[PDB]
C-alpha cells in the first residue's frame, strides 16, 4: 500500500496508579501535525483526547498530553488514575485513507 | 469490534468507455453524510473525489458523483473514460476510528 501505516509501541503494558506512562506512535510517512489520540474502553465511544498532535480537547484532563510532528508521536499520561484503564489508539487524518493504530492496551496491577 | 465496517460492492468490475458505472458503499452503523469517496491509482497518492457524501471536491471531474445518507451510499461515473481505471474507496469520518472500504477495482474492458 501507499497507505500510511500507524504502529504503536508498546502494544500492551501494565502500570500502577501514580505512574507516569508514555506510549508511542509511528507513521510510516510524514503526516505533519495531523494526529488524534483516542481512548477506547470496551463497548464504549472513543474519547478524542488530543488532536493536531499536541492539542488537548475540551474537558480533557491536563495530565494527558501528546507531542511530536512528522513521524514520531508520543502520548504521556503524567500521573495514572484508574479511570485511565483503556486501549489508547492513534489516528492520522493527514492523507486518505485515514489509518489508525492497533492500540496500546494499558492495564493495571 | 464496535468499529464501523465499511463494505463495498461490487469489489471489482469491468466496463466499457462511455458506460455509466454505479458502485455502492454500506456502513454497518449510521454515519450521516460523513462519507468520502476517493480514487487510488497504483503508485500515486489517493485523490479525494467527493466529501460529505455528495460534495464534489474542486478540480475533480464533474462526471463523478456521490449520493446517499445514513448507511447506504452510491458513487457514479456518468460516462466512463479510460483514465478512470483505478480503485474507488469510501471512507467514513463520523466516528473514531475512521474506517474505510477495501475498494471497487474498476477495469476497462
Written out in words, the top-level CATH class of the domain with range A1-109 is mainly beta
Contact (Cβ atoms closer than 8 angstroms) between residue A76 and residue A20: yes
- Across the interface, of B43, B44, B91, the residue whose CB is closest to A98 is B91
> Is A46 within 8 Å of B97 when comparing Cβ atoms?
yes
Entry resolution in angstroms?
A: 2.5
Chain A CB contacts of B89 under 8 Å are 96-97
Distance CA B61, CA B46 (A): 15
Q: CA A105 → CA A67, A102, B80, distances in Å?
A: 20, 9, 47
Chain A CB contacts of B46 under 8 Å are 2, 95-97
Question: A14 to chain B, minimum CA–CA distance in Å?
Answer: 23
Three-class SS of residue A82?
helix
Q: In what order do the strands lie in the sheet with B6-9?
A: B6-9, B21-27, B72-77, B64-69
| Cβ partners under 8 Å of residue B41, min gap 6 | B47, B85, B86, B87
B36: part of which helix (H) or strand (E)? strand B35-40
Contact (Cβ atoms closer than 8 angstroms) between residue B102 and residue B26: no
Distance CA B42, CA A37 (A): 30
- Strand pairing class (B35-40; B86-92): antiparallel
Mapping DSSP onto H, E and C, the string for chain A reads CCCCCEEEECCEEEECCCCCEEEEEEECCCCCCCEEEEEECCCCCCCCCEECCCEECCCCCCCEEEECCCCEEEEEECCCCHHHCEEEEEEECCCCCCCECCCEEEEEC
Distance CA A66, CA A74 (A): 5
Q: Which is nearest to B104 in space by CA: B1, B26, B17?
A: B26
- Across the interface, of B43, B91, B96, the residue whose CB is closest to A38 is B96
**Which residues lie across from B14 on neighbouring strands?**
B107
Question: B78 to chain A, minimum CA–CA distance in Å?
Answer: 24
Distance CA B57, CA A86 (A): 37
Distance CA B27, CA B96 (A): 14
| Cβ partners under 8 Å of residue A21, min gap 6 | A13, A15, A76, A77, A80, A84, A106
Q: What are phi and psi of A82, to 5 degrees?
A: -65, -35
Question: A26 to chain B, minimum CA–CA distance in Å?
Answer: 17
Write down the residue that cell numbers 504521556 correspond to. A76
Three-class SS of residue A70?
coil
Three-class SS of residue B106?
strand
- Strand pairing class (B64-69; B72-77): antiparallel
Distance CA A40, CA A70 (A): 24
Nearest-Cα residue of chain B relative to residue A103: B97
Which grid coordinates belong to A70?
A: 512528522
Q: What are phi and psi of B82, to 5 degrees?
A: -60, -35
Q: How many CB atoms lie within 10 A of CB A15?
A: 15
Contact (Cβ atoms closer than 8 angstroms) between residue B34 and residue B47: no
Three-class SS of residue B22?
strand
> Is A46 within 8 Å of B93 when comparing Cβ atoms?
no
Amino acid at each position: 500500500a501507499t497507505d500510511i501505516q500507524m504502529t504503536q509501541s508498546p502494544s500492551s503494558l501494565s502500570a500502577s496508579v501514580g505512574d507516569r506512562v508514555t506510549i508511542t506512535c509511528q507513521a510510516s510517512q510524514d503526516i505533519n501535525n495531523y494526529l488524534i489520540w483516542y481512548q477506547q474502553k470496551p463497548g464504549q465511544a472513543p474519547k478524542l483526547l488530543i488532536y493536531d498532535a499536541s492539542t488537548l480537547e475540551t474537558g480533557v484532563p491536563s495530565r494527558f498530553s501528546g507531542s511530536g510532528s512528522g513521524t514520531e508521536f508520543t502520548f504521556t499520561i503524567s500521573s495514572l488514575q484508574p479511570e485511565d484503564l483503556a486501549t489508547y489508539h492513534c489516528q492520522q487524518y493527514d492523507n486518505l485513507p485515514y489509518t489508525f493504530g492497533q492500540g496500546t492496551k494499558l492495564e493495571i496491577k
